[PDB]
Each structure stands twice: as structure tokens, then as C-alpha cells.
């Protein structure tokens, strides 16, 4: 019926055409029979009838008289639902300005009229006069005069001078303004003048005025003359039960406005004095402003008793506004909720449902079935039978609920798996049963949790719920390609107990012909559950081309494992059930069985595993007792030794040998060592405490303790819990944040005292508060992340691009924390891979790297494969399937139409509640260096004169195992390609002071320095070395500020020493506080010391700042372009950074603070994007200097490092999608041929397509620079104003929309949800495509 | 100090305090100035004969049983009034019959008219009739000046000299054309409009019975008097704004805003100024307080409630509340509504109705504790909707009655559909149906009774019988 929405500002004529009448009286009802009064806020003749086809006076009360208006009262005879869409108007007696356009964050009227907001408010407040059309009176067009000045001007001239005051004057000025003349004058000023601020202001003014001219709005329409009235029903006056009434605040605001307008009309008729007229006008302005937006201009008007009134803007805005509370989410029918239970007998695709809940839900279906079967003659009879609950309604319900799925949802929906579909099973009771396997996905427990039930209604909804939301259809997590239905506690414990051999048991060394007779021997009581026996087994292998090959052999296994072999599907080797079978082993087995067989065997195997684990756990019957906590016999001795050491340290402190801080450090270190010793001793005593003897002397095996098994099967508990149960719990933390020097020496088995309990209460309360706040922060972060990438949908199949992202393993200077298999599996390669030896062609370019390809790459030991990404996709308004890769929730490739942005945001935001000098080589390798300007010194060490040198360790496979940053002028023992051994020091340096060594040899002479002017003469008291300390600019005098100490190496002939390979002299201008090691008259050598210059938040605010693109507090200065450096003259500051290129000009200059240390020397050539200072790096500068790849790599690396430190595994595809969404806007440098401004900021896709069209034609394209914005800024800057208004700043968004006259095409998901139609993401993608292809055919 | 504030109360206080209050001598002087201006206006309006003409016409209408004597004269400065009106009529007729004595007899008639205390509405009618006639005269004069000064481009000073005083003849008609200038002899086309304007002026002068300059003199004299009276009244209002505020201070918590109360007090003060008399010797504050408090109380009783309540019922409620409070204070605790009838004079049901009158309505957005941040408006359901079960029962009944009516004969179905409002916009009466079918009313009745009997016969309409839920 429609395809777009248009927003603008309403003219008085249009407002009058909207109105069905005028409202002249504030009367509501007649307090007797509650009839609607005439010409009131609920006037029947204006707003339609009250009852259906009933006249107000009663004359006409039948449908026969529909359409004719009464003559006694005028009330039209029609439906009463027209009272909900009919509006009135009020004729104001004086013009009133609009509060939104006056008090919006940018003063629209103020900057349109080039008048200050303060002055405009002064004129509106009836304080000062304003001149309009001054003429030849020597008065400006916007000059403001006081009362005395206006009187003086009127006395001199009675004509050719017009002055008004207030909204009338503002409207007159707006009408008199000439938009075209203002545009041409501002363009001429832009062309003539040259200033940054003036240019920006004139550009904003020209843009606003050009958009106003393009739109059909008029400047004078911003001042309200006729205002609309809300329909009665939207502000009801219904009688409350008990003879009382309920009313909204809009009725009172309208009453106030009407009464003040009537008073103003009366005063104007009665020729009231000017002061009274002005007071009444001010009251009317205030009343209209408070009606439109209460509390914006001044103090809010209080309501009936205490609370302030609610305005239309208040209803529109807020979390409880229409957009968020009643339009984005809405209460729905056919819903139910109750408490959940386990019901372990259920299958994965079914759940339990109470009979009463299903009878109440499927009432229309039962009615229809009863009518169709002929049991009930009428729907009323069917309802009576259902109320009576006969014996046939239950059969009808069983028939209808046989194959009708339902929806189960938990109140926190963190990710996609918060809502699933199941197949109902009628049960007796009032509690829902939920499958244990989906409990981890649902994040639900059984301590009073509740869940909601939703019934799909239509055929399409039922089929969608069966094919997409079914529990068996989603077993893999969308965040990471891992199973999500793995057993947690009871099944894991049962399988661990089953598959756990013993040294000596019943029937040891028995030869078994099959697991069948193994279970025989188990059940019959003639053999133990776990005894070492020989069993003949047959296994099947898929080595053939889809066929299975059977092989039979004798294996060494146990009875438990042989019995468990029955449920394994006939596709897996026997080695996957011949271990302890913990939780990780169970998950790996499930994943292997999935990836090898398919889906149905996976779910069947999972159900069989859960059944067997439950049964065998119940058969074992493990318990917990007070004797399970075994106390070591050395705890007291260790405590005594620790106390003796503490006493000795206290005596030493009392002797004055050590300070308080050193004493505290020693005490805490001793206590930590004692705690570690106690924990290690108790681990050793508990882990192998079970000792037995088989047919001989004695032997030791793993312990049989119940708590040890519980902690070693990964079901529950951990090392920290065991330490807190059977040993001291360590050091606590005072409320200040430090650590108390006295630890807690008592465990939970023994009795803690009041002091230790009171100490632990602090940590318990801190933990509870942190847990309370983490959820509140994560909700906001998740909402902000979802709202920025909700419009991203896969729309193409292959964009045909050649770009990609270079993927390498993560090395931090030690052990690899991210193998290359994880970062490459599931991605498509951007370029064809070659052989490791660069001899033959490897896997082709456009292949999908599955597990087989990954295994082949691992076997071949490929160093680094490059892959495509979504940030380099060429698809406009979406991404292609090939660039995205594959959906890491199903085995196949990503389908077309999927709204990947929502999945990415949900996966990123779900684990948010979980978040709070000498190089020593590790392993043998070959020393490798990259970008090193090394030279041989006089001692043989390979000194390095480059600040971009990375130390790398390459093994004989050709893989990188180590990565270190080498400081400048560092001593290196080895070289490049020299074989070394593990644990060998190769590099040494002084971190407390960087060297100023030179790369050339010769003489050092003293030129351009005077003792006292720039240097001081100081003698060391201890060492006695004579050195000349260089004073900085502030320490020295003003005369010597232009004479920097210049040290230059000269040879024996007196000339400057030429650097090998070049001829530029190497002179170094020492900065302040530069201690010179050697004086004049002593020859030096290359690589020798000459001068010495002295030199992380937790949680996820780092993640929040990274996603919001917040600039660092102390950004690192970077080099704009490559070239030499030419220090600048102090200009009320430290230095001027001027970089001279090889041949280009050097207009660039920077303001360097004097409190920041600098690294570059006088004659050092810098590169583009190279660092000049030290500190946090700014992402905007990173982008501007190194493209988009560097900044997306930096963001991905930072977020992955934070999540890995927190222990959460998330794929980087989501991060990449978020970065792409954040990298959507771009500014214009200069327009080649297409109309564009020099600083306008538009969408990147628009300029891209415009440039493609220009290049296809004979014209010349333009140039642009990519811009980086935060998530909220990108969400606010959206082509569709509806989505922007739904998120935040509704008043500002609506004001800007109205002013610009913007047109909104739906073209999205949130807009289609708001309007109430099919979204173009799932099944509606094809409908939307068909609609687009039909339109403009 | 022109700004740095947002509340209009401060700005109103500043504007009010910019002026200084009066004293007894200043009040006497302003009253004397008002009296002088009123006397000048009265003389100016009595000096015209059309006032006497309207007086005689109104008296004749009163005597013709078309009005009353109440709105004729506001007392005197009723046989005496009748004889004075007869004397005035005789004076007017001798004035119209004495066209050099006309001026003196008009002056005497004006004096006798001023000796009569007429009605303010009559005086306003005389004033606006004078305004209408002078507006017509000035419109004719501006047309005259536009036809030659702004059309013939004839000289300013010459126009003034030859137009000041005559305003009736062709002094400005032929001179502006036949003065041998190149731009003078080109508007004989508008000479016709000049003649038409002259004829209009002559007709107006004949209707008025007097000259034009005297009319203009009276007009600007009464304008000066009105301006003086307005200035004096404005001074009085600006002086007594302080008293208005002081009186309005005490009603600030009765459901009305302070600014509204002070505006109503200002209106009441203006009304009191319009009727103040200084000859009694009392100060102005005593007379103004009654009017100000009456206006404030009337405004409070009128526009301080969502549902309007009449003034008499508001007074009854206030009296009941005052009694109840007095009886509670005297006796010790809350009394009973039955016992209030003994103290007052009521039939014991009016008090019950007054008590049963609903108080101010509860706000829709009021909160109830936390309630997951929900207000009172989230728990009110619409009662005007029909159930889907009811709609389906209605559809089923319509289908069943259609099926039952298909079985009957075509004529029976047609006559039934005509008698009852079935499948048509409206039903038809038995007589119109008989007329349409060319069948007598009694035969139609008998056929309807046979149809009803056949429908009451069993083995049919079983679902219709089942359509009862009792
Ligand atoms: C649910 C809520 C209590 C919540 C709580 O604190 N627990 C109670 C407290 C006050 C109750 C309303 C009022 O009586 C007025 C009115 C009476 C009508 O007859 C029925 C509707 C109304 C709106 C009532 C609904 C409901 O009954 C309310 C909201
Ligand atoms: C003060 C209290 C809220 C307390 C809170 O949680 N904060 C609210 C919640 C429910 C409200 C009553 C009901 O509506 C029924 C009834 C309606 C009449 O019209 C006026 C009287 C009654 C008794 C109301 C009074 C008052 O308004 C109540 C007690
Ligand atoms: Mg729980
Ligand atoms: Zn009517
Ligand atoms: Zn692509």
C-alpha cells in the first residue's frame, strides 16, 4: 500500500485541513450523565459520535440513518471508532514560537538568522526591542535596542523606522529574509575569505539553507499560529470503578492553553495596558512551550499534587516511550509461563507440557476440531464441553498436539539459542520438563527458574519453527564451530567412572569374545565394572570412497569400555573410547562423530551417551563425606616455619636493617611460598593416595577418592576449590585494595574464626557487587553493538575481488597462543597458495578450506595463507558469500540472505557477563632479524642502529616461534642465521637509559657550547667521572637557547666523517639532560658509548573504548610522510616537527609538548606512519597513515587478546563485520567533475558508484578519504531517520528530519519491524526481491 | 541585569516595581482628570442631533411594546421621565423648525440631554454612530485627495489652499485640470468619479444636517478626551498593581496558578477603576478590594477543575465543608452525614449527593511502587470491544438462519426478509411490504403466522434451538 515515509513541517493551512473543527471551551463533561459538552476537548460534534450509529440526542439510533448529520445537535451518525482518528485545531490569538526549533542543541532559528540564542531569547522574553526594515535611519537590520534607546529613536524619527518585539518580530524577520540573496552572499564570502572556523560556519550555513530551499518548507512556518489537538481516545477520560475518573496530563495542558488564550482575547478586546498584554503573551508562550515539551525551557510544571506533567515529547521519548515499549516489543497472546523441571526420559526434540496449559492455549483448535467431528453442534456447545472437561476433549487435544511444535524462551535472551522449538508431550502436573542437554545453551538451572511458551499460529510459522528453530537443527554454537549440547556433570561423572581401569579386580586377564559377554560378566556379578581384560572387537573404517571396511583384532581394554563400545556409531575407531573419557574427551568424540557421519547419528549418539551416563552414575552412587577432605601431616610444620621466618623478619626490621616496604614484601613473599608449598603437598597427598597390591608386593595407581574423581572429570570443582577445602585459602584483600599480611590458615573442614570470616565478607561483597554491575554494563554494550550492525545482510554470491587479509599465527614472544589452523579454517583464500618450497602450485584460489585442507596445510607446514574478508568486499549494500566464508554453525557454506550482523553482534555481546633487559630464548632455533641496520662495533658485538628491528626465531620447519623488539643501540651476541641453543642469552641492553652511540668512528670535539650557557661542570662524588651535563632550554639562559650542543665525528684530517655508502656528515644535537660519556681529545670507535640520556585496565572498558573509537589520553606522535627530519626552532614550545621529503615540499609542522620524550635524532630518516614518540596509538591516525587493513588488524588483535586473556573463544569474522560497519562513512577531498563539496561527508557506497559511473563515462572521478567513527556515531548517522530516532536523541533526529524534508525508504530490518511487515532477512528475502523486481518494471 | 532569569514572575515584579504608588492627592487629581474628560466627551456627543434622534427612536420603540424602561435611562442626574422626554422631543422639533437659532437651540438640547442619565450602551451606540459617520466622511475625503493629488499630480500647497474649507465644490475639480500644465488635462475620465464623490459628500451632508469642520472638531475633541481618560485609567491600574498582587497572594494553593490569579486581579482592578467614585471621600483601596476578590473567586470557581461545577453548587460545597470542620472542632471527631441534616436545612439526600460528587480525577501516569516501572494506565482495559467467540457465534447464526430461510418457499423467504432487517440496509414495515407485494395487511399477517407456525413445527431448526446458551 506504500513504500516510503515522508517527514516535514506542517503549514497552518495543512493543520486547518487536518482539523474537523475548532475548540473554544475547556469544558469536558457536565458532571451529570457524563455527556460530552459542546465546543470542548471532547466535543461530540467535532470528534464524532460516542456510541455505534447512535445520535447524541437520541433522534437517530439505527443503522438506517447512517451517513446523515443530525439537525438538533449536529452529530454525525456513524461508528464510534472515528473518535480515535479525528483531530481539532486551536486558533491562537498571538504567534508562538516552537520550542523544539528554538531549544534544540543547534539553534536552528538562531543560526539561520545569524542571531545569538541569548539575544533571541531576550527578544522573545519581551525584554528588548528589535529593528526590522530600518531604512535610512542608520540602524541595522538586526540591531537590538532597549526601552530607553527605542524611546530615544522614536522621539527623533516617527516614521521610516519599524521595531517590534517577540514572536511577531521573529516571524516578520523570517518572512523578510531572502534565502537566495543570503546564499549568494555566503558563497561570495566563502570564496573571498580564508579562515578555518569561518569556512566551517559558512559551509554549515550554506548546507542548511540549500536544503531548506530544496525542501518545500518556509522560514515563517517555524512560528506556530494554529496548533493541532490530539483525538479524545488517545487522552481518555473513562470513569474508574467506584465513581471516580482517570485523566491524562494532556487534557490539563490543553485546558491551561485554552484558558490563557481566552484571557488574552478578552484583554485584547478590553484594551488592556501594554504591561498586562505582555504578561499574558508571556504566559501563553510558556503554556505552549510546556505543552509541547515540559521541563525543557525553565522549570517543569508540577501536576495535580507533586509530580511534574507529562508532555508529548515525554511520551515519544524515553525507554518507556512508544518506540521502545509499545512498538519494538509488544505483549502477545497464546503465551504461558511456569516453573521448569528436568524430566530425563525426554528426547532431544521433545519437551514436557502440562495438560492444563495446553488446554488453555489450544482453545480455538479444540473448538474447530469439535465442530468438525460433529460432537458439538455450536461453538457455544463446544465451549461448554471444554469448560465441563469431558472425556473427549482430552482425546481431541491429544490429536491436535501430535505434531504442532511450540516455542520455549528464557527471560534473558543473550544469543540466538535463547529461543528453541520442541515437540510437546502431555504430562500431569504444573511444571515444564526441559531436556538436560539444552540446559547449558539456555543457561538455566532448576532452583526456581521459569520459562515462557509460545505457540506458532500459521502454517508458515509452524514450518519455520520446525525447519529452523528445532533443537536438533542447531547443535553447533554460532559464535564458535564447537558443539553446544555436551554433557556437563552427571553423564561425565558416569562415563569417567565407567572408563577408569583398576590395578586388581575380579576376573583379571580374562579373554572375552565380545562386549555382549562382557556385559554378561558385569551384570552377573562375576567380574568388576573395570578390569583389564582382552576383548575381540570389530571396527569399521571409511577409508573407501564412501564404503565401510570391517577389521577384527584383539585389543587390551576394560569391561566398562567394552560395554560402552555398543553405543558408538559404526563409523569411528575404537581408540576414541580407550581413555579416561573426561569432558574434553567426550566433546572431542562428539565433534569427530558429527564431522565424520552427519547429523542424525550425532543426536542419536548424544542421547545414548546421556542415557548410559545417567544409568551408570546412578549405579555407582558416588557420595561425599567428612573423611574425603584429607589434611596433610606437614601443614602445621610449614605454618611453624613460616611463623618463625615472619618473626625473624620482624626482628630484622626492628633492628633497622630493612624498611617497612621491604619487610612487607618479604612477609607476603614468605606467606605466598608457604601457601604454594602446602597446596603442592596436599595435591601430592590426595592425587595418588589409593595404594593397593596385586598378586605380589605393592603398586600405586591414580587415587579413588570421590572428590578427586569429581575434580578430575571436570564435572564440578577445581584446584582452587580443593585448596580451599583441604588447605589454607591464602591471602585476602582489604577494602582499600591492598593485601593483608596475615593470611587465613584454616580451611573449611576446620573452624574459621570471627576475624577470618569478617575478612572474607569483604571479598564476598565485592564479588556480589561486581556481578551485579557486570550484567548491567553488558546489556548496554550488547544493545549498542546490535543497533549499529542490524542492516547488514548477505545479498550477493561472489563480488569478484582480489583483495584479502594476510593471516599469520599470533606470537607474543614465547609459546603460540593461536595456531594458524584456527584462524584459517572456514575461510576462502584470496590468492592461490604456493608450495612451501615455492616449487609447485598448492590448493587453488577460490576453494573453501575445510578440515581436510587444514590438515594438508599443517602437514605441508605452510607458513602463512592469505584469505578474503568482509571489509574488502566489493558488494554494495551488503556482502557476498565468498568474502564472508562459511557460517560456523553448519557444515555447508553461508546461505544467501542471512542477516550476519545480528549474529555477529550477539556472539560478541553474549560473553560480556564473563569479563571481570636480557633476552632468554626458550627453544632451539635460528636467529632471524627483520629491518635491522646493524654494524660491527669495536668489541665484536652486532650493535643495531635501527628502531624497527624485530628479533625472530625460525626453526628448521621454517615457522616463526619467537618475536622480540630490540631496543636501539642494544648489545647482540649472535648474528643472523647462527644456530643457538635453548636458554641462551643473545641480546643485552640497559632499559634505564638508551645509548646515543654513533655508526662511525673518529674524533669527538667540543664545538658550539659554553660552560654555563648550555653545559655545567660537575664532579661525581663516588665514581669521580668528569662529564658535561647538557641543560635544557628552561634551565639555560635565553642567550644560549639558539646554540644547541653540536657533537660531530671528525677524522684525523679534521674533516667530517662520512657514513659508509653516503656522504652526509653525522652530527648529533644532544638534547637536555644528555650526559656525555667521553670528553675531547680521546679517539672513539664505531659502536661505542658516547652519551647517555635518562628515560592496563581490567574488565572490558578497554573493549568499550575500542568499539567506541575513543582517542587515547596521550597519543603517540607519528610521522606524516617519509623523509628526513629538520628540527624546528623553539616557538613558545619544545620543538617544531618539519619533515623534508626527497623532492617534495615540507609545509607540515607540529606542536610538540616539552614534557614528552622524543626518540628521533637530528639526522634520522623517518618513514610514513613511523613512530616519533612513545605511548598509546590513536586508531584514527593508524587508519589515516596505514590504510584500513592495519587498523582492522589492530582492532581484531586487541579484542582477541582481551577475550583470550579472559578465556573466551570468539571468531574474528564478527569483529571484522563490526569494523566494516564502523568504517562506512567517508569525506570528500576535492570533486573532479561530479557536484560535491570540499568537506562534505557522505556514504562511501554513493561516492564509489558515482566514481564508477564517471569512469564508465567520459568524465573524471573525484577523491575521498575514509573516515572512522564510533558505533554510536555510525548508528546515529544513518540514511533512515526512523532507525536513528528509535535509538537515541529522538527530538534532535526528528527536528533534523523535519527541517531537511527527508524521505525514508524502508530498506532495512528495524524499519520493517516498526512498520509491521516481513523483514528482508529470512523467508521474506524472496518476497522483498519479488516486490523490488515488480516495482519500476 | 536585563536577563539571567527564566521565571516570568521576576520579570513581572520588575516591570511592576518600575512604577511608584500614588497618594490621596494624586488619586483626587486623577479622578478629577477622569471626570473632566468624561464631561468633555459627554458635551461633544450631546452637541450632535443624531443622538437625540436615536433617543427618540428608542423611546418610541419602548412605547411600542418592543422594549423596557430599564435599558432606556440609568436613573436621573416615572411620569417625570416621560414629561422630560416630551420636552426633549418638543425642543428637537423646534430645533429642526428653526433652521440662525439652530445652533443655540442645539446647545440647549445638548444641555438638556446631559441633564439626563442615559445607559452606557446607549452612549456607546451614539459614539459608534458618530464614528461611522466620520469614517464615511474621511473615506470620501481620502477618495477626493486620491483622485487628484495622487492621480492628477497637482501641487501640495495649492491643494491645501484651495481645499481647506470648501470640500464641496469644484474648486479642486476644474482648477487641477485647467491650469495649463502638461499633466493636468488628462483625467476627464476620472472627473466622473470626482463628481460621484462630490454627490456622495452632498448626500452625507444632507443626512447629517450640519457642516464637516464642526464634525471633525467634535471627533478629535472626543478622541483627545478618550485618550486622556485612558491615560488616567492606565496610571491608576499601574499604581494599584501592588494591591492586586497583595490580595492575590492568599489564593495561591487552590488549583490555580499565581500568574492566573494576578491576571484575574488585574481585570477586577480595571473593572473597579471603571466605576470608582471619589466624591464619597473613601479611599480607592476599600472599593477595589471587593472587586478584586470577587474576580479572583469567580475565576477560581470557574476554571480550577477538570469538570466544571456551577457557582451555587461550589458555594454549597464550601458551606458544607465549613460547617463540617466547625462541628468536628467543636464536638471532637468526624460526624455522620445523617447528622449534618439536623444542623443544616437539607432533605438528607442533597448532602449525600454532594458527598458522592467525584473528586479531581486521578492522574493516568501515577506509579504504583516499583511494579517493574509501570503506571496506572497499564491496567485499564477497553470494554467496547466484542469477543471473537461472539463474532463467530454471530456468523454461525447468520449462516444457519440463511440455510433455514433457503428451505422455505421463495415468496415466504422474500416476505420474511422484507419484514425483518435481514440482508438489507433497513427493514420495511408491514404496510409498505403489503403495498409492495400487492397483498392486504391481514393476508400478509396470516402468511407470516403460517410461516412462524411452520418454523415452530418440530424436525427442523434443531441448531436454532441449540443456539440458546441457557
Ligand atoms: C495490581 C495492583 C497491586 C500491585 C501490587 O502491589 N501487588 C493493584 C493496586 C491498585 C489496583 C487498581 C485500583 O484499585 C483501581 C482500579 C480498580 C478497578 O476495579 C480495577 C482496575 C484498577 C486500575 C486496579 C487494578 C489493580 O487491581 C491495581 C493496579
Ligand atoms: C497511592 C497508591 C500507590 C502507592 C505506591 O505504590 N506508590 C495507589 C495505588 C492504587 C490506588 C487506589 C486505586 O486506584 C483504587 C482507588 C481509585 C480512586 O479513584 C481513588 C482511591 C483509590 C483507593 C486509589 C488510591 C491511590 O491512588 C492508590 C492506593
Ligand atoms: Mg537458577
Ligand atoms: Zn442529534
Ligand atoms: Zn565479496
Curated annotation (Swiss-Prot), chain A:
It catalyses: RNA(n) + a ribonucleoside 5'-triphosphate = RNA(n+1) + diphosphate. The modification N6-acetyllysine is found at residue 952. Changing residue 765 to C: Resistant to antibiotics salinamide A and B. The keyword Zinc applies. GO terms for biological process: bacterial-type flagellum assembly; bacterial-type flagellum-dependent cell motility; cell motility; cellular response to cell envelope stress; DNA-templated transcription initiation; intracellular iron ion homeostasis; nitrate assimilation; regulation of DNA-templated transcription elongation. Acetylated on several lysine residues in the presence of glucose. It is an enzyme of class 2 (transferase). Changing residue 768 to R: Resistant to antibiotics salinamide A and B. Binds 1 Mg(2+) ion per subunit. Binds 2 Zn(2+) ions per subunit. Zn(2+) 2 binds at residues 799, 873, 880, 883. Pfam families: RNA_pol_Rpb1_1, RNA_pol_Rpb1_2, RNA_pol_Rpb1_3, RNA_pol_Rpb1_4, RNA_pol_Rpb1_5. Its cofactor is Mg(2+); Zn(2+). Its EC number is 2.7.7.6. HAMAP family: RNApol_bact_RpoC (MF_01322). Belongs to the RNA polymerase beta' chain family. The RNAP catalytic core consists of 2 alpha, 1 beta, 1 beta' and 1 omega subunit. When a sigma factor is associated with the core the holoenzyme is formed, which can initiate transcription. The rRNA transcription and antitermination complex (rrnTAC) consists of RNAP, NusA, NusB, NusE (rpsJ), NusG, SubB, ribosomal protein S4, DNA and precursor rRNA; S4 is more flexible than other subunits. PANTHER family: DNA-DIRECTED RNA POLYMERASE, DNA-DIRECTED RNA POLYMERASE SUBUNIT BETA. This is DNA-directed RNA polymerase subunit beta'. It comes from Escherichia coli (strain K12). The gene is rpoC.
